[PDB]
GROMACS .gro file of C-alpha atoms in nm:
model
  100
    1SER     CA    1  -0.772  17.616   0.041
    2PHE     CA    2  -0.501  17.602   0.307
    3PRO     CA    3  -0.197  17.831   0.284
    4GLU     CA    4   0.155  17.711   0.217
    5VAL     CA    5   0.264  17.791   0.575
    6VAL     CA    6   0.002  17.691   0.832
    7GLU     CA    7  -0.015  17.863   1.171
    8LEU     CA    8  -0.156  17.649   1.453
    9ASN     CA    9  -0.271  17.723   1.805
   10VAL     CA   10  -0.246  17.395   2.000
   11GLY     CA   11  -0.378  17.436   2.354
   12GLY     CA   12  -0.233  17.788   2.361
   13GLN     CA   13   0.109  17.706   2.217
   14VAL     CA   14   0.168  17.851   1.870
   15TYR     CA   15   0.341  17.647   1.598
   16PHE     CA   16   0.419  17.713   1.232
   17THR     CA   17   0.471  17.439   0.976
   18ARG     CA   18   0.425  17.352   0.611
   19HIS     CA   19   0.084  17.221   0.507
   20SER     CA   20   0.258  16.921   0.350
   21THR     CA   21   0.399  16.835   0.694
   22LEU     CA   22   0.045  16.814   0.835
   23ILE     CA   23  -0.063  16.560   0.570
   24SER     CA   24   0.262  16.368   0.615
   25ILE     CA   25   0.122  16.042   0.758
   26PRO     CA   26  -0.161  15.899   0.543
   27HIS     CA   27  -0.487  15.822   0.724
   28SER     CA   28  -0.391  16.017   1.038
   29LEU     CA   29  -0.619  16.270   1.203
   30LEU     CA   30  -0.421  16.569   1.075
   31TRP     CA   31  -0.421  16.408   0.730
   32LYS     CA   32  -0.802  16.424   0.735
   33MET     CA   33  -0.822  16.769   0.896
   34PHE     CA   34  -0.582  16.934   0.651
   35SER     CA   35  -0.626  16.734   0.331
   36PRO     CA   36  -0.753  16.954   0.045
   37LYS     CA   37  -1.058  16.743  -0.042
   38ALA     CA   38  -1.072  17.425   0.654
   39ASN     CA   39  -1.407  17.595   0.716
   40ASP     CA   40  -1.481  17.323   0.976
   41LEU     CA   41  -1.178  17.395   1.194
   42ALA     CA   42  -1.215  17.618   1.499
   43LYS     CA   43  -1.014  17.938   1.528
   44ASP     CA   44  -0.881  18.149   1.813
   45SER     CA   45  -0.922  18.523   1.871
   46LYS     CA   46  -0.638  18.597   1.625
   47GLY     CA   47  -0.769  18.375   1.345
   48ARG     CA   48  -0.532  18.081   1.397
   49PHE     CA   49  -0.649  17.722   1.354
   50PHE     CA   50  -0.704  17.582   1.704
   51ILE     CA   51  -0.613  17.227   1.804
   52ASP     CA   52  -0.775  17.132   2.136
   53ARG     CA   53  -0.487  16.924   2.277
   54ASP     CA   54  -0.187  16.976   2.502
   55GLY     CA   55   0.033  17.237   2.337
   56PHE     CA   56   0.356  17.141   2.511
   57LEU     CA   57   0.336  16.774   2.409
   58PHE     CA   58   0.248  16.870   2.051
   59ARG     CA   59   0.604  16.996   2.000
   60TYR     CA   60   0.711  16.632   1.987
   61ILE     CA   61   0.420  16.526   1.764
   62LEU     CA   62   0.532  16.789   1.514
   63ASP     CA   63   0.892  16.672   1.533
   64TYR     CA   64   0.776  16.320   1.450
   65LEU     CA   65   0.584  16.458   1.152
   66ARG     CA   66   0.903  16.636   1.045
   67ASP     CA   67   1.156  16.360   1.111
   68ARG     CA   68   0.968  16.032   1.170
   69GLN     CA   69   1.156  16.024   1.501
   70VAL     CA   70   1.144  16.206   1.835
   71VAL     CA   71   1.419  16.301   2.079
   72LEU     CA   72   1.280  16.356   2.426
   73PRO     CA   73   1.445  16.569   2.697
   74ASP     CA   74   1.637  16.352   2.942
   75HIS     CA   75   1.434  16.177   3.212
   76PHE     CA   76   1.113  16.265   3.027
   77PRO     CA   77   0.836  16.178   3.279
   78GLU     CA   78   0.540  16.195   3.035
   79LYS     CA   79   0.619  15.931   2.773
   80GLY     CA   80   0.274  15.782   2.836
   81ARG     CA   81   0.089  16.110   2.789
   82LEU     CA   82   0.276  16.168   2.463
   83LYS     CA   83   0.179  15.814   2.363
   84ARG     CA   84  -0.186  15.901   2.424
   85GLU     CA   85  -0.145  16.216   2.214
   86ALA     CA   86  -0.004  16.000   1.934
   87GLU     CA   87  -0.303  15.767   1.964
   88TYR     CA   88  -0.543  16.062   1.937
   89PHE     CA   89  -0.360  16.190   1.628
   90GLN     CA   90  -0.365  15.836   1.480
   91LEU     CA   91   0.013  15.808   1.436
   92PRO     CA   92   0.066  15.432   1.479
   93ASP     CA   93   0.443  15.427   1.424
   94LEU     CA   94   0.494  15.696   1.689
   95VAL     CA   95   0.268  15.500   1.925
   96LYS     CA   96   0.498  15.200   1.878
   97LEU     CA   97   0.814  15.407   1.928
   98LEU     CA   98   0.679  15.531   2.263
   99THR     CA   99   0.562  15.187   2.378
  100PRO     CA  100   0.717  15.101   2.720
   0.00000   0.00000   0.00000
């Protein structure tokens, strides 16, 4: 079973969050990966769960999961890349919020 506080390595960037935050959006990729019905998920050299995506963009994914909204730094030049990340994580609402 997963621990209360999950430690994630996303593309090299380390994030900590509650397990409930990872199953926050029903039917999303993280919902499947972290729903208790673990040993399928890859791990880095220090035993952290590894997510093979851009670690810098994930910071906004996580904020969505926390707040159902995202504030982007001013003049953010990668709205489209973050949109693709949302598509990969199967977060439809976020995909719509980032639609140009």
